[PDB]
Symmetry: C5
C-alpha cells in the first residue's frame, strides 16, 4: 500500500522477477522491441593518426519497454541497485567500429537501472571506447576528418529489435563541450538505418563528428623551422665566394637539416604510401636549400676565370631566391586553404 513501505516494495519487485526469463526478449515472438538511445558525451580523450582511432567517454542510455516489468500500486519510478541488471533482459548493443571498450567500475559498476510503472526500463552505462577511424592524410595537417561511432544489435535482427535516436537531433549532448587541443568539432550528425548481413537485417545507429585540425601547432613546429632553414641558406649569398669552407658549411647544414625534418615528421605519422600536404612543403623547401648549395658550386667553379660573372650570380641569387620562395609559399597556401 504505502510507497514508503519497503516490505511492500520488495514484494512488488519479487513478483516482477518471479517467472522472469532473461533468455527471452520483451514481446518475444511478436512485434520487435523498440530501443531508444541517448548519448551524453563526457569527453573525447585523444585522436591518434598513428593508430587511426579516437578515444571516447560517454554516458550511454538505452530506453525500452518490458511488459513483464510493469507494476501497479506504486506511483513512483523505481531506481534500483545496478546489480539488478544481471536479472533482467538488456539489448545486445555493441559498437561496430570499437577496438577496445570497457564500463567503469569504481566504486561500483557505472550502471543505472530505473523502472517505470508501465514497464519502461532506463539502462545507463558510462563507457570509455576506442573506435577505429580511418583518416585521409593527403591534406594533412590542413585536413578535415570524419570519425563515426556505429551502434548495432549483435544477435537480434530487425524482426526482433529496432533502434532509434530518442529525442531526434537532441539525442546526443555534450558535443559543444568537447575540448580537443588539436581539433575543432565542426558538426555532428545522427543517422538511423538498417544494414543487411548474411544472418539478416540489423538496426544501425551512427554518430559521426567532422573534425577540423588546428594549424597553430604545425606552424610553430614544422612550417616556421623550415622557413628559417631556407632563409639560413640565403646567408651564403652575401658571404664572399673565397670563403669556401663557410659557404659549403651553410649549404651542407641547411640541406641535411631539411632532410632530418622531413624524415622525422614521417616517422611520427603512420607509414602511408602517399605524399601529404606538409610533405610537399618540406620537399619544396629542400629544393631551395639544395639549389642554394648548387649556386655556390657554380660560383666556385668559375670565380677564378670569370670573377665578374660569379659576382653577378651571387648578386642575382640574393633577389631570385627570396622572390621565388615567396611565390612558392603563395601558391602553396592558396592550394591547401
Amino acid at each position: 500500500n504505502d510507497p514508503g513501505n519497503m516490505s511492500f516494495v520488495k514484494e512488488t519487485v519479487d513478483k516482477l522477477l518471479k517467472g522472469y526469463d532473461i533468455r527471452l526478449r520483451p514481446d518475444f515472438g511478436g512485434p520487435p522491441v523498440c530501443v531508444g538511445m541517448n548519448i551524453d558525451i563526457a569527453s573525447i580523450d585523444m585522436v591518434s593518426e598513428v593508430n587511426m582511432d579516437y578515444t571516447l567517454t560517454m554516458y550511454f542510455q538505452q530506453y525500452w519497454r518490458d511488459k513483464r516489468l510493469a507494476y501497479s500500486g506504486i506511483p513512483l519510478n523505481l531506481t534500483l541497485d545496478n546489480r539488478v541488471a544481471d536479472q533482467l533482459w538488456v539489448p545486445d548493443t555493441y559498437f561496430l567500429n570499437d577496438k577496445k571498450s570497457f564500463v567503469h567500475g569504481v566504486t561500483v559498476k557505472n550502471r543505472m537501472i530505473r523502472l517505470h510503472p508501465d514497464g519502461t526500463v532506463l539502462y545507463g552505462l558510462r563507457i570509455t571506447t576506442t573506435a577505429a577511424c580511418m583518416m585521409d592524410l593527403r591534406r594533412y595537417p590542413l585536413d578535415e576528418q570524419n570519425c563515426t561511432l556505429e551502434i548495432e544489435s549483435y544477435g537480434y535482427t530487425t524482426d526482433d529489435i529496432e533502434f532509434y535516436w530518442r529525442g531526434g537531433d537532441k539525442a546526443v549532448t555534450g558535443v559543444e563541450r568537447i575540448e580537443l587541443p588539436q581539433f575543432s568539432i565542426v558538426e555532428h550528425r545522427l543517422v538511423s538505418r538498417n544494414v543487411v548481413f548474411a544472418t539478416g537485417a540489423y538496426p544501425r545507429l551512427s554518430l559521426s563528428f567532422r573534425l577540423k585540425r588546428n594549424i597553430g601547432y604545425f606552424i610553430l613546429q614544422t612550417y616556421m623551422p623550415s622557413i628559417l632553414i631556407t632563409i639560413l641558406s640565403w646567408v651564403s649569398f652575401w658571404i664572399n665566394y673565397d670563403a669556401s669552407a663557410a659557404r659549403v658549411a651553410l649549404g651542407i647544414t641547411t640541406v641535411l637539416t631539411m632532410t632530418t625534418i622531413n624524415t622525422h615528421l614521417r616517422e611520427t605519422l603512420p607509414k602511408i604510401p602517399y605524399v601529404k600536404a606538409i610533405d610537399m612543403y618540406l620537399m619544396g623547401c629542400f629544393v631551395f636549400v639544395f639549389l642554394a648549395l648548387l649556386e655556390y658550386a657554380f660560383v666556385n667553379y668559375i670565380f677564378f676565370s670569370q670573377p665578374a660573372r660569379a659576382a653577378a650570380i651571387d648578386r642575382w641569387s640574393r633577389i631570385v631566391f627570396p622572390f621565388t620562395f615567396s611565390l612558392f609559399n603563395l601558391v602553396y597556401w592558396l592550394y591547401y586553404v
Copy 2:
C-alpha cells in the same frame, strides 16, 4: 547474550540479512539517505601534461545509516569481513572525471565494512584513480594548475541520495604529506552542490587542488642551455673577421642548436596550438643568435672595402648583444613572475 559468543553474533548478523533486499536503498520511498564521505589521500603518483591527467591513490570512506542493519544486545561496533559488502546496499558512487580507476585487491580486496548498533555503515575503499585535468600551458613552466576530483551518484538523484563532506573542512586529510617533485600544493578546497541533468538533479562533491609548478628543473634543463648557446654566439664577435669558417660555424651551430632545443621541448608536451611562456623565451633567444650570424654576414660583406667600419660593428656588437639580451631577460622574467 555474551558479545564474545560467536554463535550469538552469527545469529544476530543472519537476522539482519534475512529478508534484506540489496536492490532497495535505505528508506526507499521516503527521505533521501545522507551519505558522508571522507578521503585520506595516500599519494599523488604523477601529473601528466601530455595526457592531461593525474594519478591519485586514496582511502575513500562512505558513511550512511541503514535501519535494516540496526542491531541490539551487542554494545560493540561490528567489523565484518569485506566480502559481506556484496550482500549489502552501497551507494553508486563514481568519479565524474576519472579515466581509469581500480580497487586494490592484494591480499584481499582493499575494502572495509564496519557496522554500528543504530544501523550506521562505514564503507572504506582504497582506490587508485587517474582523473582528467585540463591544463592551461600558456604560462608554462611558470603556470599554476587547478585539478579537481568530482564525486557524484550515478543512478540515484537528490530525491534518493544526498552527499556531504563528513567533518567539513577536515573531510580530506593527507594533502600536506603529498610529495610531488615537480609541483607544490598551494591549497585544496571542498565543494558540495547539486548538478541538474536530463534525468534529474544529482548530488556532487568536488575536491580540488591548486598546483604550483616548480621552476628548478626547467632552469637547469631549458633556460640555462639557451643562455649558454646565446653567450656562445657572442664569441664570434671577438674572432677576427678573416676567419670566415670559424665565425660562420659559430653562427650555424648556435642557430641550429636553438631550433633543436625549441622543437624537442614541444614534442614532449602535447600538441597545443598556442605559444607558451617558454616558447617565447626560446624564440627570443633564436633571434639573438640569428642576428649574431647576420652580424658577421654584414661584416664579411664590407670588411674589404670598409675595414674600419667592419671593425666598429664587431666592437659595438660586443656591447649591444650582451646589453640587449640582459634587458630581454629583465622584461621576460618580470612578465611571467
Copy 3:
C-alpha cells in the same frame, strides 16, 4: 501453442535444458559432431615486423547440430540472450598461432546464440586476435608475406569433432574491404585438414592471406634520402681542390649521414642476422659516398706535384660517379622487382 506466447516459449526452453549435460558433446559416444565455421573479417588492425604478428578483428561463427536442443511446435528460429551460451555445450575452438585474443564485452559480451527447430545452433563471437606471423625480410621492403590463422579443436579429436568451412570458398567474407595502408591483400585461401599429435588427430582449419608490401612509403623515407645524399657527395667534384675544408666536409657529412640512415633503419626492424634488400641498397650507397671522399684524398695527395692529373681526376669523377650510380640503380631495381 502460440509462438508469441512467452509462457509457452519459456516452457519449451526449460524443457530443452532440463537434464542437459554441458560436459557431454552432441552425439557423445557416436559419430563426430560436424562444426561449420564462417568468418566475417571486420578489419586487420596492424601488421608488425618487430613483433612478427598481426592483429585481426572478425565475426567468428560456429555451426553445429545438437539433437538435445531440438524443439517442436514453434515454427520460428529462437534467438536467445547471449548468457544462455553458458548453459550449452560449445566447441572448444581455439586459434593455434594466436598470441593474445579476447571477446568484446561492451555493452554485453559480443556473443550470439540462435537455435533452430531441428537442434541446429548458431554461435557467433566478435574476437580481436593477435596471431603470430613469421616473416622473411630478405627482400624487404619489396617482400611478399603469407600470414595464416590456424583454427583447431583443443581437446576433442577427429573421433569426436570435425571441422569444415561452411559455404566453401565463401566461408570468409570482408577480405576485399580490408584497408592496410602498408600492405595489399593479393589473395586469401581456405584449407581444411587433420593434424596428428601425440594425443590423436585433430581437425584443422587454415585461413591465409598473401600480403604485398607497398613501396611508396619507403621511396619517400629511405630510398630518396639515400639518393640525395649520394648526389650531395658529387658536389665536391665541382669544388676546387684547394678548398680542403669544404670538400672534406662534404665527404664527412655524406659518409656519416649514410651510416646513420643504415643503422637507424635496422633498429626499427627486429634483430635479424641476414642482409635485407634495403640493406644492400644502403651499403651500396655507402661505397659511392666513401669513394667520393677517397677521390679527393687522392686528388689532395697529388694536386701539388701533378696539378694536371688531379684536375683530370676531378673532371672524370664528374661523369663516372653519376654513370656508375645510375647503373647500380638499374641492376638493383631489376633484381628485386
Copy 4:
C-alpha cells in the same frame, strides 16, 4: 578412524565448515587474533627512479589460529586445495605503499592452505607487488636508498588483529640471494609497531632494504665520456693559433657535446628541481671546455699585435687546464665518496 580413509576426512572437513561464518574473525568479540607473517623473497625485479618504485616478488605467508577449525582424531596436518580459502576467514592484509600487485594464477591461484589439529591455519600467497619508494637523488649516482614494504590490516584495528614477525629476525628470507645489477643490498630490517588513524590503531609490519647503487655503469656511461670530451678540448692548445677553423671547431664540438650529455641524462631521470651529484660534475666539465674555447678567443684576439703573449697563453694553457681539471676531480671524488 583411519587417516587414510578419505570418507572420514571428508566428514571431518565438512563438520569444520558446518555453521562456519566467514564474516566473523576468530575469537570475535574477545582477545585479538595474532597473525604471524613470514616472507620468502623470490626476487626484486627492478628499481626505477623514474617511477620512484620497485617491483618485488615474494612468498607471503600468514600464520594464525582459528578454534573453529580445530579437528581431532587425525594426527596429521591437512593440506587442502587452495580453493578452500574462499570458505575460510583470512586476514585483510594489504600493503600500504604498493602501487600495483597481483597473485599469480598459473596453473592455479598461487595459494596455499594448510590446517593443523589445534586450529592453526597456514596461508601462503605468491605475490608480485610494485611498491612506491621515494628516493633522494642529490648524491646520485653515488646515493644510498632505503625502500620499505609496509604491511597493515585494512579494516580490523589492534583490538581485533595483531601483527608480529614469525621467527623474529629470520622472518624474511632470500634477501642475500637477490640479484640487482645496479644495486647491492647493504642491510634489511624488520619493524613491528601500531599506527593510529582516525578509525583507530592498526597493526603495522615494515620490511626495509638499504640499497647501495653500483657506480660501474655510470663510470663507463657518463663519467668517462665527460673526461674524454674535456681532454679533447685540450687538443686545441697544441694546434697553431692560425688554424682558426680547426680550433673553433674543437671548441664548438666539445661545448655542444657536453651540453647534450648533461641534458640527455636529466631526461632519463624524473623531473626533480635540485642539482644532483652527477649534474655537478657535468656542469664542472662544461666550464673547462667553455674556458678552453674562450682561451682561443683571447689568443685569436691578440695574436696579431702580440704574438709572443699569445704563444705563452697557449703554452701555459697546456699545463693549467690538465692541472686544474685533475684538482677538480680530486675534490669532487673526495666529497661524494
Copy 5:
C-alpha cells in the same frame, strides 16, 4: 549399457562426482599422487636482455590417477567439456621463475580434460609465460645463455605429490621447431629433483635451454660501422698537413661518432656495472681514432720548424695504424671466439 547412450553416460559421470571432495587430493592420507608432465613448446616469443626474461608459449599437460574417477562399463576414454575441471581436483602446479603467465581463453579456456576407465586424468593447458632468466653479458654479443623453466607444486610437499617427466627425455617436444631470429637452441635438458624449504620438501621439474646468440646482426649493426669509422680516421694521414680544418674535422667526427656508438649501445642494454665484449671492441676503436687526431696534433705542432720529420710521421702513420688495428682485430676475435 550402450556407450553411445548419452543418458547412461550422464548417469556415470554424475555418480563419479557425487560425494567428490575437490579439497582432498587423490589418495589423501596415503601414498603421494604421482603427476606426470609433458610440454609441447609452441614457440619462444622473445628473449629480452633488458628485462632479463623470455616469453614462452606451450601446451602443458599433467597426468595423474584419481581412483574416485574410475568408471566401469564404458570401454572408451571420456573427453569432457573443459568446464568440468572446476569440479575436479587438479595439482597446484606453478612455475617458480615466471613473471607473468596466463591461460588462453578464446574461444573457450584453452583447457582439456580427458578421463580414463581406471581413473587416470589428462589435464592440458595452453599457457603463455614470461619467465625470468638472469644473463651474463660479459661475452655479449658472443655469449651463450642458459634459461630455465622451473616447475614445482605450491602447497603439497613430497609426502603428498611427486613429479616426473612422462616419457623421459621425450617429455618436451617442439624444441627443434623453435624459431628465434637472434638465438639458436644448442641443447635442452630435463631435470627432476626435490627442493627442501622451511615448509618441507617439494617436487621440482626443470626445463633448461642453452641459447647461442647469432652474431650476424651485430656485425652489420655495430662492428662494421666501428671499422668504417676507424678507417675513416685514417684518411687524414693522406691529407696535407696544411689543411688544418680538414684533418681536425676528420679527427673530431670520428672520435665523436665512436663515443655516440658506444653510449647508444649501452643504453639499449640493461644498466650492468661490468665491461662487455663489445664494449672492449668499441673502446679499442676509440683509442685508434683518438690517436689519429693526436697524430695530427703532433704533426701540426712541428711541421713548421721540422717539415721533414712531420712528413715522415704522416707517412709512417699510413702503415702503422692499419697494421696495428689489424692485429687488434686478430687478438680480439681469437679471444672471444
